[model samples]
Target: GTSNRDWWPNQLDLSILHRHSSLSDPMGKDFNYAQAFEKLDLAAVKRDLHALMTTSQDWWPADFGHYGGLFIRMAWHSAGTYRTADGRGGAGEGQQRFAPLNSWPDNANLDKARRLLWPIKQKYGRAISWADLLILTGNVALESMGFKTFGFAGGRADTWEPEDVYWGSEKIWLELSGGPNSRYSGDRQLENPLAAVQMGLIYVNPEGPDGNPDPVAAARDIRDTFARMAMNDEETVALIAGGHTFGKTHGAGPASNVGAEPEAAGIEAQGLGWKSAYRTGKGADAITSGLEVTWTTTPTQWSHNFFENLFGYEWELTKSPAGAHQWVAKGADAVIPDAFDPSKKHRPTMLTTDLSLRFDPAYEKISRRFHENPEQFADAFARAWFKLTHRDMGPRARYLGPEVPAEVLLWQDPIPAVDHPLIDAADAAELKAKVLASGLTVSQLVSTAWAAASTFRGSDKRGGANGARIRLAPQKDWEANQPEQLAAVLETLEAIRTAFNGAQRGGKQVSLADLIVLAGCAGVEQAAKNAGHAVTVPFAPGRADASQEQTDVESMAVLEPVADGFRNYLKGKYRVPAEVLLVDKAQLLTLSAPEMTVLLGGLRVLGANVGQSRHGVFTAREQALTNDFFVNLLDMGTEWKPTAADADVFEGRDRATGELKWTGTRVDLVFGSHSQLRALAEVYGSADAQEKFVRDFVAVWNKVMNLDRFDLA
Candidate 1:
């Protein structure tokens, strides 16, 4: 049941508790009720999804399906499993727990999902399992889609390690619940429905000679791989099919068409039509009627409808002009036979009632549509699927209405709606006053406000059928809402102190100029929140690239100014001392030719190419010339060395040619090593436009210079 790699006990002896947690709040006429229910608005969710789908149009065409479609599917699946009716749980279940629910092959193509949800888990706490959260989030996403609901039940436990369940038990399902001898007998009467169909596809082209070939070897390979991972037969089928449901069909290799002429195999090879491209002989009559109807009917909807049409119908087989046997008659019914056989080698044997019973035309049709238009299909499927997976909800569930509740909606009287909570007027006024008095230039004020607003957070609480979950703790949220409360106090105190000191020196009234100077005092008080990196003009003193020891000091110098400015702005626009401006020496060293050439070239290949753009330090032309020059220098066969004085400096020669070369040294500078050329290309060319470019370019340079391979002792 488990692998040696698995550590979970067959039976976990932990106590389990079931409790009904109403998703409601009894405080102040339940003003916040709307926020909880608001999370389930499908139309709004669809709008957001539509925006995302449209935004991805510019992505690489070839990668749209594998990476893009997979991402969409993963996101949808993660948020599609929440049950509104059950109200037991949400996507918080499998945050990191590698359980069956999390790692099942049905959910394998989700390494990206881990990256996406990492931050969310970190914010909530690592204790939360990704499995629980993924399923719950998926359910909520569905509710947003106008689908059935899976009620939230929060008892799904988390796991620190991978579980046997994650590997799956579908393979066992097939071997234990089988119908035919796979190796010697190809029985028409004893085929496993799933295996039969799978094997039939494989037999149509054993060596994967079809256009979209499904060979026995491949099936065996998939089975073996999943089996080793602990998958049972049924799970394997579902997992494979489930994965296939996302795109057109399972992925294919180069071998399709007998002799490599280009041919599709079985039904998939034939392109889902009654054509001769797939069937080479008499087995073509069994092309399912359901499949035909689905291809003919609303072929847009992604589901099993196609499969249903195929298995439930009949077809007439005739020879094509090219001599290949194909379906040719009109309105003929053809049944797609089941072919699973797992005894010796998993293969399909015959048709049976079980096959007919499990035949899902809708599932097949959906799968096709998914392959064709993944975004549309995923959006539609996610909507419906989430509804099906989420818990059923009774009509009595109190939801936010058009007209807000009178007593509870009092918060909305001044504000237009009862959506997110409104900040108190007192707080707003205090913040405004601080802004007015901060003495910051309009631009600085705008930047400071932009940064602050961009990172704002608010409090939220839920106590419906799923229990209470709080976000943005009351104290922090309320304090944040106080709006420049701290800023205003600091500004006023500093101004008063400045005025008192000034009056002693003979001034009648304190002027705004005095307050501007006093801004520094306020900045000291606001340092806690604005403690990080300083900012500066692109090229200035203390901003030059230096050695490692010099790097930290230089960076702090530049960053301290920006931080001080932000702090002063927060403290009512006080004029804090300009923070130091320092260049990243390590980064500069990396940008050197020997180092930068390798890195940029690698990035270009990986499709993350970042070219150096010069604005303030260099013109675009200059940057290009610089790149070419360095590229040529490296190509000219030069050796490099690092001296104690200049950490990034390199000196070497072409031993074969005996051509000496030197860089980072103050003496006998080569044409390439001259600082004048650097100035001409960077600073003297276009100082303004190349600022950010120069910074980034320098960063790249520094990265390259730090590589171990660049050194030659």
Candidate 2:
């Protein structure tokens, strides 16, 4: 049976323990639980959220509201249900997707938030979860506002039935109009002062029995509620003040009624008054809508303004027609018409518990210090928020550890630019039309092109299409490995010649050698990107094609494999010593040890084979551009064995599986056997080093594609 302990371990305690562990855990076996979480890229998720949250929808305008504010509120409400003692609620299980949790009135507007995330969910269904998305969206919203929050880890699984759902207190509202009542009553109320503090932290409109102040009672309420969640005084102060930095009350007003068109198709229309609207203006008969005011002058930016305004400005208790007690600025000069206008100063609004922070002796000192130094406040809030979101998540959620610096947590690589100068639009269109006209799929054309390009290198300089000499009739008829693919290559060559026979760019006829190089480069680039590698191999095209009369059969034979080079052609049949096998094949390719290692890794993963041997390192995800080959080579769990049938071949058996799962050629084994090569292998083998591996591979690939084009050099 799946228990709460399994689903939601105590993250705080385990986080401390995770700090001392090394990040060099082998992907093959060590730290399987953490590896499960690492499969998700949090930085990419943040990038996606930045795009979705910042893009202004037609329904949502800056004047009325932004989705970022609503997302923050959604994250808060989903996690606010936790009582800490039983570990029942919070955003861990994603119960908000069904039943009583979904229907809670406090969660009325959140359905729109969830609906907004549906497309993202569909695109990244396997790598993400509803719970993680909900929480991360809020953090991204803060990030977009220029606030750095903590990093996030995945692995929070979704729950299904009532039995799997943990029971929690449903205190919908604390105070009632008549008196204390059951949960879900009208006219929001609190069970105690600490409950009042909790409501304030979530930006709920707080009102007493008849609109009055009770600082001592509110302080007690804060402690009582926070204690249940294992939150200390510092964490309570930070979270309460930090969360109040954005969003505004949605009382009855013209702005509240904006964007009321029915929910978009595929999105469930929960009900009316459940969506954000543009704040056009107040009607002539418009009544007060609680404290319909933004928290900060720049409501969209996260700063220490919430705390600054709390102590710096004078506030007076005010009531709206909705009967909610809120604090408004004391003087007329404090109310600015356009809060977003920096030249103007706007009066700040506060809930009862917000003002109570100053009155409570225990919280007063910390609140004032945070107001004085925004940086200190920002750092403290990040830690507190990290703890709050991970409270119900299990130990796996702390994969990055507790003491991880804020900078690493918030780091994001710049998105790569999309440009391929080597691929001319006109040339690409013409080649594509010609290839398609020949009834060949792009995949077939690409494979054919790759086969030709890869086989062109034999004795290093002896093999490449330097003058298009590899396209000679004798060379085409040569018995290369995968000879069946040569016919397709011939067809592709004819297509290129036919497409560019008289084709001109800038008053120059397109060279046959350039076209061949372009075709091959295009195939490799597209395949690499399709396999999830963020790389763009550089391509320069100027090679001149040569006629068969320029090269002879002797030159073609030099390009043929006399021994193993980039790939093993003989497998178990060794014609040379093991040390001789370690030497670079053909010597004409000019590939370094690292380059050879990376190229072979890429080739093996793409299912490219020289003879009958298929490298098993990439048996599972063969097409995924990765460093798994290097990683598995150095994995301690792998037991290497000399093949009984073939003395030259070696295989690796998984210790856990007791089955031979990988095969290697004598040439490939040098990467692990040779000390210098093994050092490079180890660098690429680490889980954190995949980016460098992809980059190095792309550089080597570009060099390989142009080995014979000395004219351009």
Candidate 3:
């Protein structure tokens, strides 16, 4: 049943989550990319970028001697892949240079945009990553067109083509991503974890939802889709209105004239696809979105004209020359100039998604305000654009480069920098002793600690114990977190923190964040002692407690666990299998299968399920840090059968006597049900494995607790 890892400790073991092995990284592990990037001359990078935007090439030239619009689209789409559900797919990696995205219908002609930057990339070498360059180029593009940017943070390192991201289940490539052949049906929901309404496009289809050109429906799709990316009404309107302000969409002719996408193109194409080498539909005849129309009178320069034009015209719905739906202003003369030829003017028009801003009341309100107040629009667009590009980059601390903004944005999940001396070994020991005497059980300590730390998603590197955000709003109240138990634990820990600080001298103090994790380490150590082994759970104590004021409640709320398999918790009936959500959360936590297995095995024995649900508590010796969870789970004498109430619930009974010994949800039973995990479970469930089990569990627990320590990294 298992095919991978014939090397050692082999099992089926859900290893595909980490397919981007070190073997794939061209830059060796010792290469500190951020340190290298910091050595860059920011001015020269910008200087070079400014020249490239206007310096057209003969092979695949810039429109109107400007690549600003194309560069903007490249970066926007690169960052636009991020969704609030799982926090995956953003410009954190320069993913746009790869397949699917590179050759998507919406990303047409973008292969050339990347090529345009190849020279800059070549010159910068290792000093600049394509991830940072993609976003930074857009910032430069805006600045070149007379727009003041809200600073840039250049720390995004280039990742080799991401192998783990789940774009969608769709087999077809953009017949507009949702339609009769749909990712969603009449319910109109654009599938979970995917921000795009279409399979190939980054967001919604520019023409409309499913290429049907109704602006009201378009607004609905826009609002729903952008909300999936955590954008508010103003930010949504600002991004759309601001983005369409520059650049014309290509559809000068039918796409059947265009060549194959990058992946399918001939080898001589050299990773660049679309456009037949400046042949038939090369420059003006390029068919990008199949909806050719420039939004503003001044296409290359930044202006309020996009808003002005939208407000100034009462437009009739029409099709582009390539037959895609769009809105053209009625009775408008040739005011908008051709992208390539300045002498030839074209009619002003808006994509159906653009018109959504005019039709949707909230979007229209924002649009009207932007039209009237250009300064506010500029500020909103700049800030929103920065957030759009940098949202996937964890915290402000992770942001490198001279242009890193001084302003602490809430969406950055700002934690005030605290260089206060952390509690040393003696101090940590004293606090741990005090915590053990604080009447908190091992389950309480372990559950609270796991709850605080487990939210750290490796996707955006957000949500961790470093900020102690679990004790704050939204996270403290998540249903899956068992708020009642969590609050009581926090109160005790807060008191311990206060008492210890009151007793501290010589400028040594303990942060509540550090104490919370330290308390859990004490609990795990005590549990190991109860099982007849002396063990020390590792604790590092420099975590800073961020204020509730600086925390973005709305943004952080998205990270709340709808289902956490480690905790053996689920909020609602999900479409996928319980084990699948478990695997998803485990991958987000960056846990190897052994780590995932051992952590869950220990949590079950310690009774750490959300809401104190005992579904997976297989051990009679609760909280002893024993291997009983694995031992009891694989006990062949006990056969599991579905419960009367729910199929997901199962009752494990003595095989011959028919005595009910234990109960478990799908999460617990899955370890034995699946071939690979059962093989792993066998390793820990062996007769002489308790010591190794405890050691493994403590190591994984410590790893989870420190996943977000960017300072340590």
Candidate 4:
């Protein structure tokens, strides 16, 4: 019964295998293990999803709405089965493909969504796991609805037999937990009450309010259930609101037949047909109770409209023809002349739990806050979604890093850490004043420190200012150094001494190296944020400054001739050979191939240049910190043209848009050309890949900044 043999009827069919063979390797080479693991093209998957979601399928006519909502619902149901207590029944194992799990009534009509994604499964095969596809599709669908940045990282493994897995017993418990009369009845038992309310509000409740599911009990149930999954109240409210922003209730009316015919009594149908007919009520309301209404005015768009609409209108309890009790705005003109009047009726609807968001004091404040600030809501929702989707996966789940948690990677509020002590507020203020007294702003001091530290040898990745050496007392007139650049470094170093005023800070003596690295960290963070990159650069203090008396002239030689992998400092004069670029830079920065690629892409976007020669990926929107450098580099629309200045350098231009775009350096080219680097590059090159790139780049950047700091925590 637990055999690993292929069980599907056509599992052994070679014709299906042959048809999908091209998807495995277009290059026609025997698959390598590493290459095989990296073959999942999430960008292409996103593209396919966009096409399927945006375009109206013939089977689901205009009367039906976009399938984005249903896709989100399908993904939600697949993952919502997890019980963290035993680490069972998560989306990670794709358990929904087997018995008991697939045949569960709560998952009814979801088969359409599974069937819809079958082609995607066929196209990508084992390159993408079903568990990952389902979750990613849900995230992409929400993105299509205009939600803020959502993240995806793939590593979920598939399960061959549902009963043979550890989660097998868990599913049996879930099935027995709710009987026909309980609130946990059927599929509703698999999900929390908060989710039920969300799904209920969007689609009419087939179970109705039969069990006297009071708001108080429901809220408690939600908290108890969600706590089991490691979610708090804020997260619960956020996930509920975000999920409600799209899709509609079906079965209460004829218009509900948008995509597929209603198989069960009250479950709402999804797609464009239901959306249009539900909103307009064109002759369909006479036969149906018009219970199929969108949660937000812009059903196709994801926004704070759900919260706004819920609070803005006065609702009256109304029962659908299917006997599902829901709230509808009073004086709603469902049909006849003057129907769909915005001034008279908002057409807003709600469930008992949605009403609780207004009436229940515990949740009302949160809902009101979300309604007041849509941006806050979007940010919170993204974080909650990340936690929700990743709750049960084991070590295989991609660990972002200690500095960047799952929430931050999903673009939540920054978490500042005091890993190593720094100056207090008073000291920071005094330092700013002293820096200003030297005819330089704190910003200038930061900038100069970063530029100077960036000049270190490519051989040793130690980026922090090691010596009181940046003071430039002895090496000021050195031929390899720029006078103006050295002057700025000296000026900043002088200000650091004045700011300390000989007082111990953070319970330790402040060193020039620590201040210099702190300033550099400040500069990089400010630059990144100002350039529109929502990322946090981790900082750890305690680097002791080296005295110029302890340093020798020969030691300064390596630091003098700055060789950078990102840019050509002296017209390729100081640049390493193209073949040894990665090896040399990796040694210099202690970075991996993927790490180097990500850093270079970030540097290109930040407009970090050398010798005023800014070419390649740094040409357009140079100030914006984005992954467009990677995205555009891998884009098929642009062709690389060699430059007269250097044979190794190339420029890219968009063929359709006819826009002249900057090209990539030899280092950047290697990311797309090298096998290992190219695989990581493909991951970061997609439109939806920013979160992963930000996490990886920030971690590597922090490592680079701390290379020389042995005292770091």
Q: What is the C-alpha lDDT of each candidate?
A: 0.28, 0.56, 0.85, 0.55
Clashes of each: 159, 13, 0, 14
User: Per-residue CA lDDT of candidate 1, range 1-713, in tens?
Assistant: 77532763332211111111122222344333234334444344334433333232221121211222334345444433322111212232333223333432233324333444455455444233354345444444333323333244232334333211111123331122122433212322222112112221211121221212223333443343333222334433433333223222111111121121112215433211122223331121112111211121211123443333334455333332232223322454332221111121211111111122123343344434544564544454333333222212111122232322232211110111222222233323333345346554222222222222112110001111010000112211222223354244334534654544444432333222222222221222222113221322111101111122312221111111222111211212222211110011112121232222232322221112111111011111221212332333333376555666653334556757756443322111122343333332333123352333333433442222222110110
Of the candidates shown, which would achieve the greatest TM-score relative to the real structure?
A: 3
- What's the lDDT for residue 692 in model 4? 79
lDDT of 2 by residue, 1-713 (tens): 99655775521111211222244222233434334445666677678898887565443333223567778777877677654323446677676665555644455546556777888888776457687788888888888878887666555554443212223233433243243333223433333212223221332334432245555455655665665554667878888788778766555444234333333312554432334333432222222233455567666777667886788778787764345567786763564334234455556777777776787888888888888877888888888787677655532213342323344221111111222234465665566456455554334444444444554332112345445544565656554345556566656666567657545554455455566655655555555666676555566755555555545454244345445445455434443454343343423255556676777776666545543357544446654567877887787787888889976678888988878778876566767776666887888888798788778877777776776453443
Which order, best to worst by TM-score? 3, 2, 4, 1
Candidate 3: which pairs clash?
none
Model with the higher lDDT, candidate 1 or 3: 3
lDDT of 3 by residue, 491-546 (tens): 99998888888886777788888888999899898888878889988889888889
TM for candidate 3 is: 0.95
RMSD of each: 24.6, 23.5, 3.0, 23.3
Model 2 TM-score? 0.44
Q: Model 1 segments beyond 4 Å from truth?
A: 1-48, 54-92, 95-103, 112-247, 254-388, 391-713
Per-residue lDDT over 1-713 for candidate 4, one digit per residue giving the tens place of the 0 to 100 score: 65323455321111211222335334444543223436666678789987777565444322134677777777776777654333345576676666555645455445556767878888988776777778878887888777755566565555455432222222232233344423344444433212332222222232233334255445655665555555667887887788888766554354343332233223544221122334333322322223445576666777667887787778887665545566777665432111223343235776665666666677888888888987888888888887667654422123221212443332111112224456555554445345445554323444344444544322212223544455544445443334575576566655567546455545544556556655545545555665566654565544554444444443343344334555443323432355353444344444556677787777666545443355544435555556877787777887677679887777777888768666666666766665656777888888798777767766776666655443332
Best by lDDT: 3
**Model with the higher TM-score, candidate 3 or 4:** 3
Give the lDDT ranking, best first.
3, 2, 4, 1
Better of 3 and 4 by lDDT: 3
